[PDB]
């Protein structure tokens, strides 16, 4: 789950070389479907994603 009430079930442990790596070098760690959003309307997982990415890039903890 997350902290925005959005359960997932672990379906497939995908090998790391098959993951979509980014332009910075990073693989992801959990892939989340864009079809869990529009019926559930958790905007708070979007702001938490931007917020935690920007807090891990600055040494900050965000309010």
């Amino acid at each position: 789950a997350s902290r925005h009430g959005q359960k997932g079930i672990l379906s497939r442990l995908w090998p790391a070389e098959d993951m979509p790596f980014t332009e910075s070098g990073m693989v992801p760690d959990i892939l989340f479907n864009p079809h869990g959003f529009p019926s559930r309307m958790t905007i708070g997982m979007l702001i938490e994603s931007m917020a935690g990415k920007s807090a891990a890039l600055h040494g900050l903890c965000h309010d």
């Binding site: 990073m26 760690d29 891990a56 890039l57 040494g59």
Partner: peptide
């Protein structure tokens, strides 16, 4: 903490 992680060589935000 924004300078104690760059100066340990943790540049990606998964390592930091």
């Amino acid at each position: 903490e924004g300078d104690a992680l760059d100066a340990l060589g943790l540049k990606r935000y998964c390592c930091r």
